[PDB]
């Protein structure tokens, strides 16, 4: 009826409630001070969180080519539940839903007439700014998920334990992590959780009622963005109560069915030899100067444009990390850390990639060919840049039709997912809370997401995931820390006979 | 009295025979069809190419610093036949030894005026003159060269089958590849080989004529070129008459002290500190944007300069591939495959890289120097790069006679050379053929360099070779994610006590 | 009382004197003689500096990552004699140190208004002043060192040898070093770290004068600067005679103490946000351009900006390569090869790239804010730049002079320092030497810094230290190699059940 972890189940309800007044009845106190703490947060710490997020993928590197790979995650006697192929296909549909679909054609064209660091010719800006996306949706975001999944699964597989926050830091505080110590931790990574998955509405929401405005004309206004968000997240109550099936799995095949075949449509009816060439020729690019853009950090200029793209992107990385980690770790059972981390690194850090390539350099294509007009619609506003990128494609009402579904479809996958993940870290067990409790949770997301949009809309999203973020890449440092010493004892313990 | 296979030799003599009466009776049609089917697949597939040459050095050097590279060739209880210092030495002269005669001078200066990418000064125009010379021929050709005398040597020595590129393909099609569909493998190659070797004898024929007119002041006419190519064609006959004794390695030697000969004579009489300094300059900017340079495929600029340099080596170097990896494979018994490896990607790919920087670098100083009289020369024809070069040197008629007599001695040896190898393929066994079939096969091959000179010159030999090295790149492909199969399997058969 | 290595001593004085003579008895015909001369073994072989030490720092590398960094140092049945953070700590303080506090600062302005390559914007200046100042200090001197220090420790400890260049080249030279063989050998080590030793003093004297001249406005006659070299050295030479014993690690010590303090006051008084943003930024693209700065010859511009710069760090670093060698083998014992050459590459290299940002940075980001005062003062001079810098910093005088101090104490140390490992060199055994030839090798190493002071100023320090680290550059390449041979016989000799 009630099974949850107290104080950690009130301490973030208070906590939410606490946040979600503020924004409601100071209205100037809460527009005034959230950009104010974003900003003085990012430039503060942009240096910590380009390092941690650095720190992390060498570390994954690391876990992959040496001894600590050829540990089976859940055992030597485990073997895989799935085949690599459907094993790649999960991790792909684990990321990215919403922030893909919303990002891949705004970010590459902002990166164009915005430059990060000075360019003369429009060649350059383009291949910067396709490097630059390349970096923010490569190999980091896929490091540190990488990194939250082993962690996870490792401990929840070879310790027979929670696959929450609380178990990951068990082999340097041992039993501590059981009372008011671990209680921070777990505390932490629900309120990083549900405000990366509350990004990720929002963001779903902006962009569902930009291509509404576009393909109709509609004058929208909050009133309908909340009755929206409302009724999507009774769809999925529904669907949770009166369970008509597992509506997760099929419905991330589904997803992940209808986004290859919207990639295939836009590459073969968009440029076809240019994406091709873009991607081998942007990959190897990226692969190449990628200590000069991973570390760079906009010391000298002082533009500030790192505070809203770079940086913004680590923190949402490693806030939402524990959401992806924690459905990594389901679908990686009995597969070693080194074919784990290179799967989670590779496989979909290049299908994001492609993805990139395929809608934002094809983007770039069309401005470099004299065609600027998704610039000036994305310095309009750069949740309509899908829709006007459509506009100049064969079946722009079908594909955009097509493109709201999908985006739509990820809302309630994600809506659906997170739950999950915030019931089980805020109750413990693995699942025998009841329905009630992830509905409850669902609502909380929703209205959460809802408060931030009328509160800024994509200026407070960013601003709390960066706000908590930030002790949450502490967190990160430390656990992947408390992982490389776990996963030694381990190894230890094994090469015993 | 013909050891023969017949649907290999008789499909081989007409497609040739059938290319060259399309030639001789079509001059206007085929000198309009062939640039056209050139530039078509070169600009749909050099994405294609450029990953084809990258997996293929990427697999190189996997292949080296694994557990496969413990491997020796011709199992444990084998020894290699020559020394380490005499086995280097023969390797660079194995491969590419007119093309660097031609293309020393020539492409260096000809990516100074006509620049791959667009930059301001003169030396940043020498600076990536000489990169993307060391990129054409520092690695990957020595990278494709590796991986092919690798399958050749592990499957003609370690597994006994025949030394062809039926064999190459066993592992993961069984006995299927004896009828009719290893025939299409041997017929490619077959094909590939005579095309690439053709190119090399038009190189040589060229150059040649153009050193005897600039030396001279003759003018000679294409019956003097075809009467030259019969003269040649006709010592290396007279030398295979039964012996006499096999004029071959001798030859070898003698063409590798004249080359080194050759070098050291530039490098002392020309710029000493100058080309040292260079060399180490360029071979560390090189090794510091190899990715940056090897993935680039002019996609955002689209000039079409990669159509004619870059994309053309890639399918040159994949076209003859057989014939350099055969007597890489002959000279390399009892060697592991890392010690292989290394041995013919580092060595041989240094002193590529030396030549090409004493040449083409001590030409770029001499054009820095205010002295541009071999962009004029090269602008109007790059036959005549080196004799125009050798012009300011002392001894000039000295050293364009001996660098004349060393394009000729090239000549008898890759046409002594390549016959092997096309007579191997095309009637199977070991070397059981009579002469008269190598006699055949030079003089094929000599008629059909003849007959691409007719065609256009320095526009055909690129138009067969890229056109026939385009399959032979997904052959190398194939033949590549085969090779590690079928020697995993010699590796795990041989690890069993 | 005289115990001595005749042929060494002998030598080595006869040559001191020779050298002193020549200096203070042919003043005009020196003075043009030692500059020519030393741009021209510049000029004729930077090529082979830069070779040197890229081939050093990979061979490092190597060890480090090779079945040879399992060797345990003195046995395996030996221990560390300090804790890691106890080692890591006094690694840093075996020198640099002068140096550091000499360029520090004139360093990074100095490539600022002479830039090694042209640039156009002034943030472009300060990043190549950056990374080619981290080039100069980061990882090349430390790969000389460790690769010294480990030859040294494991010819020292694993082979029960004494700890000089004599026994790093027993491998292939066998007994023939005890005889006018590897005489040659001791007689260059002795002259290379007895004139590294004397170029850190002249450097330590002239920044103490300057910062005197800066702070109370006194007129230094050379007659001064002796008299300052005199009494320091006699303080030096009172401490080993009356003091003693173990004071020079407490003095190191407290020069490691003070030296993070000063640091750190920098760092906190200064820009905090800026230094640590630069920190990150600059090592990313140090590691991000490594290959194409530490390979880079400046051969297609001729500037000699290297003749003063580059080339002179690369000699110094191998000429006084046996005096941080020495103290990095005694503080180096029953640790793996991999551990010693991983801590003393890495985290003296990363505190000593944090120093130069922590400084010179701090003052490019004065210059880029409009400030150009630096500038100018280190174009007068470069002696100042130090002093000059804390001019814009709060308790001016106060940090002068703390800094005078620390450069008077590491004066004291690297003189007292030094002087063990020449009189080892000179005399033989493990410390048996009596002190008077101690203080009598201080003396000399004294009136040469004097003499050379009088000859040049900071031109012929320069002088005498490439002269003398061309042979030594050979010497270091070739034990190199033999270090490789003489320590895989061991790991054989290990092996063997």
Not at 459 to 473: C, E, N, R, S, Y
């Amino acid at each position: 009826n009630l099974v949850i972890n107290p104080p950690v189940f009130i301490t973030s309800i208070l906590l939410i409630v606490a946040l979600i007044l503020t924004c409601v009845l100071f209205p100037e106190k809460v527009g005034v001070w959230f950009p104010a703490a974003q900003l003085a947060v990012t430039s503060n710490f942009g240096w910590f969180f380009v390092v941690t997020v650095n720190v992390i993928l060498i570390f994954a590197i690391y876990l992959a080519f040496s001894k600590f790979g050829r540990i089976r995650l859940g055992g030597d006697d485990a073997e895989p539940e799935f085949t690599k192929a459907s094993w790649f296909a999960m991790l792909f549909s684990t990321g990215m839903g919403i922030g893909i679909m919303f990002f891949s054609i705004a970010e590459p064209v902002s990166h164009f007439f915005n430059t990060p660091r000075p360019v003369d010719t429009d060649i350059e800006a383009a291949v910067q700014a396709m490097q630059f996306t390349s970096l923010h949706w490569g190999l980091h975001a896929w490091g540190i998920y990488a990194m939250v999944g082993l962690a996870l699964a490792f401990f929840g597989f070879n310790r027979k334990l929670p696959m929450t926050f609380r178990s990951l830091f068990y082999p340097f505080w041992g039993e501590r992590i059981h009372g008011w110590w671990g209680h921070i931790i777990d505390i932490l990574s629900a309120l990083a959780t549900v405000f990366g998955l509350s990004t990720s509405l929002g963001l779903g929401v902006i962009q569902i009622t930009a291509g509404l405005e576009y393909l109709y004309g509609w004058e929208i206004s909050p009133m309908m963005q909340a009755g929206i968000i409302l009724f999507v997240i009774g769809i999925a109550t529904i669907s949770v109560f009166s369970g008509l099936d597992k509506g997760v799995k099929i419905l991330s095949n589904a997803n992940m069915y209808i986004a290859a075949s919207f990639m295939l449509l836009i590459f073969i009816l968009g440029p076809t030899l240019f994406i091709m060439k873009g991607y081998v020729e942007n990959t190897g690019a990226y692969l190449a100067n990628f200590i000069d853009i991973s570390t760079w950090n906009d010391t000298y200029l002082g533009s500030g444009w790192q505070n809203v793209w770079t940086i913004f992107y680590w923190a949402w990385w490693i806030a939402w990390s524990p959401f992806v980690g924690s459905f990594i770790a389901r679908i990686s059972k009995g597969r070693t850390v080194k074919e784990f981390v290179l799967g989670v690194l590779i496989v979909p850090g290049l299908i994001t990639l492609l993805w990139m390539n395929v809608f934002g350099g094809s983007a770039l294509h069309t401005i470099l060919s004299g065609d600027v007009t998704m610039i000036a619609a994305v310095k309009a506003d750069v949740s309509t840049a899908l829709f006007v990128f459509l506009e100049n494609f064969p079946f722009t009402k079908f594909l955009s039709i097509v493109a709201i579904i999908l985006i739509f479809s990820f809302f309630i996958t994600s809506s659906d997912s997170g739950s999950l993940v915030v019931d089980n870290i805020t109750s413990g067990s693995n699942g025998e809370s009841p329905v009630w409790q992830r509905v409850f949770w669902s609502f909380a997301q929703g209205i959460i997401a809802i408060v931030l949009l009328w509160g800024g809309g994509l200026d407070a999203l960013q601003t709390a995931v960066i706000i908590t973020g930030l002790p949450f890449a502490v967190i990160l440092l430390v656990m992947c820390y408390s992982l490389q010493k776990g996963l030694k004892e381990e190894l230890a313990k094994s090469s015993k006979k």
